[PDB]
Amino acid sequence: STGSATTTPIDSLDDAYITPVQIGTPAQTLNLDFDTGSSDLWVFSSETTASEVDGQTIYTPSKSTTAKLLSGATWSISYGDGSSSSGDVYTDTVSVGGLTVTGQAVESAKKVSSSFTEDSTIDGLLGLAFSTLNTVSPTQQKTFFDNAKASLDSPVFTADLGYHAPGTYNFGFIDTTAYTGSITYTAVSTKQGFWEWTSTGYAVGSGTFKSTSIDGIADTGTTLLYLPATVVSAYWAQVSGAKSSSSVGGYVFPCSATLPSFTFGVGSARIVIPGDYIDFGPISTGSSSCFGGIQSSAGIGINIFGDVALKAAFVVFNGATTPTLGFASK
């Protein structure tokens, strides 16, 4: 089997991407944030504290003939950005782009933090990291990909995120028309539950490539590219007037700037992020200070190849017995 679904930016800045997901019988379609940095499929629901729902579409398990309460199961997750959610658990039929999993754990939110409430366009998350990170207790649950894997034509999914445009998540096949050149594969460590890999270095604009190992995670659920402070300083030093602002919470730059590209290495291959991908617009409405898309990971404890990096590539998440990651230009 295979599946293929379009993923769409939630706003003009590509702050996140949403993908329609069918849950239950008859189908209830929710728009979920596919997140290769976490492993819970959770949704706004009829159980979510009323004051914490503001425009989201909700899952109502009582209206699904295939929904079953997973007795005694609860979940609670806290994300790196400080947001969180928690609740109870159902199993139900879940379909993504024509690919169907029966008995998928659907984590129904009873509580969500303010950032989720305030984002009317995101109805929940669909985690695509390794199932070892799943927060369901007392019986840990599998991700949608984990459940689907055996049935897939090939045990892979791909992320093809667009810049200011829709893109695609495919399951079970590699669309050879979706990228240019070849796919370069690189080793993955699953030790922390992430798609963790090691970039071979970077370049800023037309500058020389610096060969250096940068360990980080491929994370579709994080907006920006978070890299070591040395690397980030080297990038922003090429932008007149750019500075790190403690009050704003990162590097900012004059909105009048033309940003240089940023290149990262995948083995001997190179992925080029155009400068425009690194512009996240005014820090507040009407400001001439703009927020940078490359930020320091100092304090996070890990480097994160988020959407800013991933959208410059066609990315293969290879879930074979020994997982690997593939990157191609596009």
UniProtKB/Swiss-Prot annotation:
User: Which of the seven top EC classes does this enzyme belong to?
Assistant: hydrolase
This protein's UniProt keywords: Aspartyl protease, Disulfide bond, Hydrolase, Protease, Signal, Zymogen
Please give the catalytic activity noted in the UniProt record. Answer: Hydrolysis of proteins with specificity similar to that of pepsin A, prefers hydrophobic residues at P1 and P1', but does not cleave 14-Ala-|-Leu-15 in the B chain of insulin or Z-Glu-Tyr. Clots milk
Q: Which domain of life is it from?
A: Eukaryota
Instruction: Outline the extent of the Peptidase A1 domain.
Output: 17-328
Tell me the disulfide pairings in this chain. 255-290
GO annotation terms (biological process)? proteolysis
Q: Name one GO molecular function term.
A: aspartic-type endopeptidase activity
User: EC no.?
Assistant: 3.4.23.22
Where in the sequence is the active site? 35, 199
Q: Which family does it belong to?
A: Belongs to the peptidase A1 family.
- Name of the protein in question: Endothiapepsin
Source species of the chain? Cryphonectria parasitica
